[PDB]
Write an enzyme that holds these catalytic residues in place. Structure first.
Site, PDB file in Angstrom:
ATOM      1  N   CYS A   1     112.345 -39.374 -47.823  1.00  0.00           N
ATOM      2  CA  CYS A   1     111.088 -39.794 -47.059  1.00  0.00           C
ATOM      3  C   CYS A   1     110.854 -39.094 -45.783  1.00  0.00           C
ATOM      4  CB  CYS A   1     111.319 -41.324 -46.706  1.00  0.00           C
ATOM      5  SG  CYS A   1     112.528 -41.909 -45.398  1.00  0.00           S
TER       6      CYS A   1
ATOM      7  N   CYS B   1     113.798 -42.056 -42.272  1.00  0.00           N
ATOM      8  CA  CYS B   1     114.871 -42.918 -42.314  1.00  0.00           C
ATOM      9  C   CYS B   1     116.161 -42.470 -41.442  1.00  0.00           C
ATOM     10  CB  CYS B   1     115.193 -43.618 -43.717  1.00  0.00           C
ATOM     11  SG  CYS B   1     116.231 -42.217 -44.722  1.00  0.00           S
TER      12      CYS B   1
ATOM     13  N   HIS C   1     114.845 -39.526 -66.574  1.00  0.00           N
ATOM     14  CA  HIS C   1     114.838 -39.038 -64.982  1.00  0.00           C
ATOM     15  C   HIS C   1     114.875 -37.518 -64.730  1.00  0.00           C
ATOM     16  CE1 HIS C   1     118.711 -39.066 -66.546  1.00  0.00           C
ATOM     17  NE2 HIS C   1     118.886 -38.208 -65.715  1.00  0.00           N
ATOM     18  N   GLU C   2     114.891 -36.659 -65.727  1.00  0.00           N
ATOM     19  CA  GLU C   2     114.735 -35.312 -65.783  1.00  0.00           C
ATOM     20  C   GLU C   2     113.227 -34.771 -66.345  1.00  0.00           C
ATOM     21  OE1 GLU C   2     118.008 -33.029 -67.422  1.00  0.00           O
ATOM     22  OE2 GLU C   2     119.426 -34.746 -66.734  1.00  0.00           O
TER      23      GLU C   2
ATOM     24  N   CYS D   1     118.860 -41.054 -48.952  1.00  0.00           N
ATOM     25  CA  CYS D   1     117.525 -41.640 -48.411  1.00  0.00           C
ATOM     26  C   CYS D   1     117.654 -42.994 -48.715  1.00  0.00           C
ATOM     27  CB  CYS D   1     116.284 -40.623 -48.875  1.00  0.00           C
ATOM     28  SG  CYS D   1     115.043 -41.591 -48.420  1.00  0.00           S
TER      29      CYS D   1
ATOM     30  N   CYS E   1     117.730 -39.625 -43.318  1.00  0.00           N
ATOM     31  CA  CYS E   1     116.938 -38.536 -43.674  1.00  0.00           C
ATOM     32  C   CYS E   1     116.948 -37.620 -42.243  1.00  0.00           C
ATOM     33  CB  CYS E   1     115.592 -38.635 -44.009  1.00  0.00           C
ATOM     34  SG  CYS E   1     115.193 -38.973 -45.687  1.00  0.00           S
TER      35      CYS E   1
ATOM     36  N   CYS F   1     119.747 -37.110 -70.894  1.00  0.00           N
ATOM     37  CA  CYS F   1     121.133 -37.019 -70.478  1.00  0.00           C
ATOM     38  C   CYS F   1     122.027 -38.129 -70.663  1.00  0.00           C
ATOM     39  CB  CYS F   1     121.480 -36.041 -69.324  1.00  0.00           C
ATOM     40  SG  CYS F   1     121.676 -37.149 -67.752  1.00  0.00           S
ATOM     41  N   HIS F   2     123.387 -37.927 -70.568  1.00  0.00           N
ATOM     42  CA  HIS F   2     124.055 -39.107 -70.797  1.00  0.00           C
ATOM     43  C   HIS F   2     123.754 -40.291 -69.737  1.00  0.00           C
ATOM     44  CE1 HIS F   2     126.936 -36.057 -72.791  1.00  0.00           C
ATOM     45  NE2 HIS F   2     126.671 -37.165 -73.834  1.00  0.00           N
ATOM     46  N   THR F   3     123.296 -40.061 -68.641  1.00  0.00           N
ATOM     47  CA  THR F   3     122.988 -41.125 -67.675  1.00  0.00           C
ATOM     48  C   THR F   3     121.560 -41.958 -68.479  1.00  0.00           C
ATOM     49  OG1 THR F   3     123.247 -39.827 -65.733  1.00  0.00           O
ATOM     50  CG2 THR F   3     121.683 -41.587 -65.491  1.00  0.00           C
TER      51      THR F   3
ATOM     52  N   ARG G   1     114.934 -47.290 -52.587  1.00  0.00           N
ATOM     53  CA  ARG G   1     115.969 -47.718 -53.600  1.00  0.00           C
ATOM     54  C   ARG G   1     116.125 -49.266 -53.793  1.00  0.00           C
ATOM     55  NH1 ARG G   1     120.728 -49.026 -49.959  1.00  0.00           N
ATOM     56  NH2 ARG G   1     122.190 -48.353 -51.901  1.00  0.00           N
TER      57      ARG G   1
ATOM     58  N   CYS H   1     118.248 -32.785 -62.196  1.00  0.00           N
ATOM     59  CA  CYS H   1     119.501 -33.633 -62.159  1.00  0.00           C
ATOM     60  C   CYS H   1     120.744 -32.677 -62.386  1.00  0.00           C
ATOM     61  CB  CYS H   1     119.277 -34.450 -63.540  1.00  0.00           C
ATOM     62  SG  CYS H   1     120.903 -35.486 -63.969  1.00  0.00           S
TER      63      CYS H   1
ATOM     64  N   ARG I   1     121.962 -29.703 -72.710  1.00  0.00           N
ATOM     65  CA  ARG I   1     120.673 -30.356 -72.599  1.00  0.00           C
ATOM     66  C   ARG I   1     119.577 -30.465 -73.639  1.00  0.00           C
ATOM     67  NH1 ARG I   1     123.306 -32.640 -68.971  1.00  0.00           N
ATOM     68  NH2 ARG I   1     122.482 -33.403 -66.785  1.00  0.00           N
TER      69      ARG I   1
HETATM   70  N1  LIG Z   1     127.109 -36.871 -58.495  1.00  0.00           N
HETATM   71  C1  LIG Z   1     125.869 -36.754 -59.039  1.00  0.00           C
HETATM   72  O1  LIG Z   1     124.968 -36.732 -58.330  1.00  0.00           O
HETATM   73  C2  LIG Z   1     125.630 -36.710 -60.321  1.00  0.00           C
HETATM   74  C3  LIG Z   1     124.539 -36.153 -61.010  1.00  0.00           C
HETATM   75  C4  LIG Z   1     124.365 -35.959 -62.506  1.00  0.00           C
HETATM   76  C5  LIG Z   1     125.460 -36.129 -63.261  1.00  0.00           C
HETATM   77  N2  LIG Z   1     126.506 -36.600 -62.505  1.00  0.00           N
HETATM   78  C6  LIG Z   1     127.923 -36.939 -63.097  1.00  0.00           C
HETATM   79  O2  LIG Z   1     128.400 -35.627 -63.901  1.00  0.00           O
HETATM   80  C7  LIG Z   1     129.215 -36.131 -65.036  1.00  0.00           C
HETATM   81  C8  LIG Z   1     128.858 -34.751 -66.133  1.00  0.00           C
HETATM   82  O3  LIG Z   1     127.917 -34.766 -66.749  1.00  0.00           O
HETATM   83  P1  LIG Z   1     127.391 -34.199 -67.832  1.00  0.00           P
HETATM   84  O4  LIG Z   1     125.788 -34.251 -68.335  1.00  0.00           O
HETATM   85  O5  LIG Z   1     127.875 -32.692 -67.619  1.00  0.00           O
HETATM   86  O6  LIG Z   1     128.035 -34.694 -68.903  1.00  0.00           O
HETATM   87  P2  LIG Z   1     128.627 -34.021 -70.429  1.00  0.00           P
HETATM   88  O7  LIG Z   1     129.000 -35.279 -71.258  1.00  0.00           O
HETATM   89  O8  LIG Z   1     127.958 -33.039 -70.850  1.00  0.00           O
HETATM   90  O9  LIG Z   1     130.135 -33.347 -70.060  1.00  0.00           O
HETATM   91  C9  LIG Z   1     131.317 -34.039 -69.692  1.00  0.00           C
HETATM   92  C10 LIG Z   1     132.325 -32.894 -70.230  1.00  0.00           C
HETATM   93  O10 LIG Z   1     133.638 -33.484 -69.885  1.00  0.00           O
HETATM   94  C11 LIG Z   1     134.557 -33.208 -70.745  1.00  0.00           C
HETATM   95  N3  LIG Z   1     135.594 -34.335 -70.792  1.00  0.00           N
HETATM   96  C12 LIG Z   1     135.701 -35.547 -71.354  1.00  0.00           C
HETATM   97  N4  LIG Z   1     136.593 -35.952 -70.834  1.00  0.00           N
HETATM   98  C13 LIG Z   1     137.419 -35.297 -70.317  1.00  0.00           C
HETATM   99  C14 LIG Z   1     139.039 -35.019 -69.840  1.00  0.00           C
HETATM  100  N5  LIG Z   1     139.857 -36.100 -69.943  1.00  0.00           N
HETATM  101  N6  LIG Z   1     139.381 -33.870 -69.407  1.00  0.00           N
HETATM  102  C15 LIG Z   1     138.646 -32.588 -69.160  1.00  0.00           C
HETATM  103  N7  LIG Z   1     137.349 -32.617 -69.802  1.00  0.00           N
HETATM  104  C16 LIG Z   1     136.747 -33.897 -70.292  1.00  0.00           C
HETATM  105  C17 LIG Z   1     133.792 -33.377 -72.263  1.00  0.00           C
HETATM  106  O11 LIG Z   1     134.546 -32.731 -73.361  1.00  0.00           O
HETATM  107  C18 LIG Z   1     132.338 -32.647 -71.681  1.00  0.00           C
HETATM  108  O12 LIG Z   1     132.611 -31.190 -71.921  1.00  0.00           O
HETATM  109  C19 LIG Z   1     128.806 -37.634 -65.391  1.00  0.00           C
HETATM  110  O13 LIG Z   1     129.727 -38.521 -64.984  1.00  0.00           O
HETATM  111  C20 LIG Z   1     127.500 -37.536 -64.418  1.00  0.00           C
HETATM  112  O14 LIG Z   1     127.289 -39.108 -64.470  1.00  0.00           O
HETATM  113  C21 LIG Z   1     126.508 -36.794 -61.290  1.00  0.00           C
HETATM  114 ZN   LIG Z   2     114.921 -41.086 -46.024  1.00  0.00          ZN
HETATM  115 ZN   LIG Z   3     120.231 -36.472 -66.004  1.00  0.00          ZN
END
Ligand SMILES: NC(=O)c1ccc[n+]([C@@H]2O[C@H](COP(=O)([O-])OP(=O)(O)OC[C@H]3O[C@@H](n4cnc5c(N)ncnc54)[C@H](O)[C@@H]3O)[C@@H](O)[C@H]2O)c1
Ligand SMILES: [Zn+2]
Ligand SMILES: [Zn+2]
Ligand SMILES: NC(=O)c1ccc[n+]([C@@H]2O[C@H](COP(=O)([O-])OP(=O)(O)OC[C@H]3O[C@@H](n4cnc5c(N)ncnc54)[C@H](O)[C@@H]3O)[C@@H](O)[C@H]2O)c1
Ligand SMILES: [Zn+2]
Ligand SMILES: [Zn+2]
Lengths: 378, 378
Positions: free
Chosen positions: A98, A101, A68-69, A112, A104, A46-48, A116, A176, A371
């Site tokens: 864990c 901690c 990570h997935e 957790c 947890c 993914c993008h991460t 880290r 993820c 994905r």
């Molecule tokens: N909080 C967490 O634990 C956690 C875990 C996983 C991912 N994330 C985060 O969630 C986000 C989404 O991830 P993804 O894999 O779905 O990303 P992705 O790139 O697949 O999807 C993002 C979407 O946002 C749209 N977009 C971009 N700019 C926009 C705007 N200005 N207005 C409206 N729509 C817009 C894009 O067209 C796209 O459809 C990322 O920031 C990621 O890092 C967070």
């Molecule tokens: Zn812990």
């Molecule tokens: Zn991911």
């Protein structure tokens, strides 16, 4: 036996930002105390991963093995490990559990802290060193997972033991984006039946929020995305109204408030854009609306609003992995998937191999791509 | 008898921003349908009055009769008024409770609703005119209350009927600051026994938070004020640790996190300073800490943080009138006072007369002043 021995295997090594990944034979050291060595059969990207690869991650260290997935099968465990054993099917998780901690034990959070300090700088807790090497030089781990590889070594506190009949080419996504979206609704927001919801960004995260909201019994599920082709896709996931900010001169928050005669009960920001985060809060209803930040902003970026937004009853929150505790609840998510209560397959738009990983990375720029899952055997 | 007559009485009139209020004989017209004319016996002053008087308010309409914290006795009621009558002891409230609008019916907020189209522009609903005049020229109402007068006329939906034995020179505080601070704790935050709390600003609001937190069972009740003299005073209200930010080079949020090994469970901003609002969020504990904005910031000013604060489990909220429903719950707070379960007397540091109201505005600069109560008879 590979037990207690160095394993030589294929891994995609990122030696520099923005250079193609190199498929190398790496040496994967055996697990030390509290460690688990996992044969990774399938890994998603993914993008991460891409963000770190692109040189923008403040924590990025090179060379490293990203990813990570994933889902695989335990090859061996180190001293003291009791919760998993050789042959178990597992999902390695970038968020540990864990059970011991302050976080947890609090009962008030899924964070957790345990590992880290090592995982954030690409090493293991036990010896503060990596388990990967090429030509006797170390290769950093990434997110405590390093799943772009036929084999990895992770902390025991990060390994979820899952149903051994679950398809490993699908449940890799339960490490993820899918839990994060479902959990944002069910755990963080606690969306009630009849709620009206807005979802900003209809990628995998936003589509999992839509699935979670639909499952929870939401009424209006309004998707917002700058790419209008995302809506037909999103329908199957529960989005039932759509707005592209580009079709309106007025701020998107004002459009959603108009649409809903005052705003939504809950909003979810699923992008990582601080302006859109603000819009998400401001389109929530006065008196009771709640906005959940799910997207991850860049370093130094700030969210803003006027405090009257909160004084007049809106609540601003955020979510980490959907509020799920990884070891305990990832397996439960797998059970739900096996009983057809959650979608997983529908998020997998492409299937390639670890060998074609650079090709997979090119697919991340395609709007149609949710994905992409990689078979690590070739 | 005065029922049906215009009453001529003393009032303090603000003819324009920033000039001394003029103590004038004014004409107070009889109540029309759904209105209540109240003999005000004691009124207090606060920042909210001064905000408009100083010319900072955008609603600022002059000439007007300011004042919103008061207690008195009903002199007469208009057609259709059933819930109060002549001789009843009442607190007029800037927050209405109609019980019949979408917000009152929701059960999710205290923010009515029903008479703002009139009160917000200084007039009455029934005929969209003011009940006050001097030499035949209209004087606008303020906040739907206008209590810097011997008599006022207010919408029935804004009138709390209270224990007629309660002392009117004390319970005049129960229409604004004391409820806001108590309820921020009991209603907004829902602070649990054993919680650790930070309170930023130890004026009447912050001290009411301290008392709410102490009553709720809070453990550490950490006060923060730039005037160190405020602490000795705050101790009786429940504050049991104190920090003056001027005593530290580091930002206050960092000081508070160091002092609490990670942050507080709940924070309360009781000043109206957007920078402090941010500090109060950032000193909340990872995973669970909640910050409540109680302070009212200048129009246009923004609050900011990095969204990682919320993704890692802090929650940002705010409160209007402590979540209390005025007509229902102000009489309950009076009952609590009369039963010695809440403090009121201790917030009243000065007593003056309405004749001396300009000196009262001068005392709002006074570090030693919490609330000043005005006797309207002179
Ligand atoms: N909080 C967490 O634990 C956690 C875990 C996983 C991912 N994330 C985060 O969630 C986000 C989404 O991830 P993804 O894999 O779905 O990303 P992705 O790139 O697949 O999807 C993002 C979407 O946002 C749209 N977009 C971009 N700019 C926009 C705007 N200005 N207005 C409206 N729509 C817009 C894009 O067209 C796209 O459809 C990322 O920031 C990621 O890092 C967070
Ligand atoms: Zn812990
Ligand atoms: Zn991911
Ligand atoms: N939310 C609502 O419904 C509601 C209702 C009533 C009042 N309020 C608001 O609550 C706030 C406080 O009112 P009050 O009557 O208690 O005010 P006050 O002036 O008596 O008290 C403010 C206190 O904050 C302190 N202070 C000022 N700057 C500070 C800083 N930078 N850091 C630390 N402390 C600082 C002052 O020394 C003072 O002790 C106001 O903004 C008022 O508008 C809100
Ligand atoms: Zn007040
Ligand atoms: Zn109402």
């Amino acid at each position: 036996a590979t037990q207690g021995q160095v394993i030589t295997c294929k891994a995609a090594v990122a030696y520099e930002p923005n250079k193609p990944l190199v498929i190398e034979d790496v040496q994967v050291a055996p697990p030390q105390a509290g460690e688990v060595r996992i044969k990774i059969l399938y890994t998603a990207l993914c993008h991460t991963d891409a963000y770190t690869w692109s040189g923008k991650d403040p924590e990025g260290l090179f060379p490293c093995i990203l990813g990570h997935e994933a889902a695989g099968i335990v090859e061996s465990v180190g001293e003291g490990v009791t919760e998993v054993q050789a042959g178990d099917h597992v999902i390695p998780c970038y968020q540990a559990e864990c059970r011991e901690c302050k976080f947890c034990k609090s009962g008030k959070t899924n964070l957790c802290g345990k590992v880290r300090s090592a995982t954030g700088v690409g090493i293991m807790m036990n010896d503060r060193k990596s388990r990967f090497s090429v030509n006797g030089k170390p290769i950093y781990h990434f997110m405590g997972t390093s799943t772009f590889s036929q084999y990895t070594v992770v902390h025991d506190v990060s390994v979820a033991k899952i149903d051994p009949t679950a398809p490993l080419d699908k449940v890799c996504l339960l490490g993820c984006g899918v839990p994060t979206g479902l959990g944002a609704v069910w755990n963080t927001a606690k969306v009630e039946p009849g709620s009206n919801v807005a979802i900003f960004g209809l990628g995998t995260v936003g589509l999992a929020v839509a699935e979670g909201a639909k499952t929870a019994g939401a009424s209006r599920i309004i998707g917002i995305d700058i790419d209008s082709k995302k809506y037909e896709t999103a329908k199957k996931f529960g989005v039932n109204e759509f707005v592209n900010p580009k079709d309106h001169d007025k701020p998107i928050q004002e459009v959603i408030v108009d649409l809903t005669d005052g705003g939504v009960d809950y909003s979810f920001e699923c992008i990582g854009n601080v302006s859109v985060m603000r819009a998400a809060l401001e389109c929530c209803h006065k008196g009771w609306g709640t906005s959940v930040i799910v997207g991850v902003a860049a370093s130094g970026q700030e969210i803003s609003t006027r405090p009257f937004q909160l004084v007049t009853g809106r609540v601003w929150k955020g979510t980490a992995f959907g509020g799920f505790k990884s070891r305990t609840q990832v397996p439960w998510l797998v059970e739900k998937y096996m009983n057809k209560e959650i979608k997983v397959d529908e998020y997998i738009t492409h299937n390639l191999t670890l060998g074609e990983i650079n090709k997979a990375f090119d697919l991340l720029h395609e709007g149609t791509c949710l994905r992409c899952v990689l078979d690590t055997s070739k």
